[PDB]
Amino acid sequence: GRENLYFQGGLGFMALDEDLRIIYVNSGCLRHVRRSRDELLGRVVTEVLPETQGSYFDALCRKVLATGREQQTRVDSLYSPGMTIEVTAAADSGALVVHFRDVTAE
Ligand SMILES: C[C@H](CC(=O)O)OP(=O)(O)O
Structure with a gap:
C-alpha cells in the first residue's frame, strides 16, 4: 500500500513547497476539505486550512x-x-507530499 504522487491509488493527495504553499492538490483531496482548487492552490496551507494548525x-x-x-x-x-x-507525509523531490486513506471499515 505504497501510493505516491504518480500512483495515487484513488487517494487524496496534496503537495506543499518549502514555504508550505499548496502547489498540488487532486480532486479527492478537494472534495475531502470541500473546497475548490482556486481557493487552495498557491496559498500557505495554515492560512486556508487553519483547522490543521495545532x-x-x-x-x-x-x-x-x-x-x-x-x-x-x-x-x-x-x-x-x-x-x-x-x-502519510513524506518528502518527494523537495516537496512535502501528503495523502490519506479512509480506514473506517478496518
Ligand atoms: C488534515 C487532512 C486529513 C484529515 O481530515 O484529518 O489532510 P489534508 O490537509 O486534506 O491533506
Whole structure:
C-alpha cells in the first residue's frame, strides 16, 4: 500500500513547497476539505486550512521537515469526524507530499 504522487491509488493527495504553499492538490483531496482548487492552490496551507494548525497534522508535517523521514499515523479525520483515516507525509523531490486513506471499515 505504497501510493505516491504518480500512483495515487484513488487517494487524496496534496503537495506543499518549502514555504508550505499548496502547489498540488487532486480532486479527492478537494472534495475531502470541500473546497475548490482556486481557493487552495498557491496559498500557505495554515492560512486556508487553519483547522490543521495545532493538530496531529501539524506535528506530522513538522516531523517530516525536521527529519526527512516519512511519517504515518491513524487518526480520526479533522475534516470528516467519525471517519478513521491513515495519513502519510513524506518528502518527494523537495516537496512535502501528503495523502490519506479512509480506514473506517478496518
Ligand atoms: C488534515 C487532512 C486529513 C484529515 O481530515 O484529518 O489532510 P489534508 O490537509 O486534506 O491533506
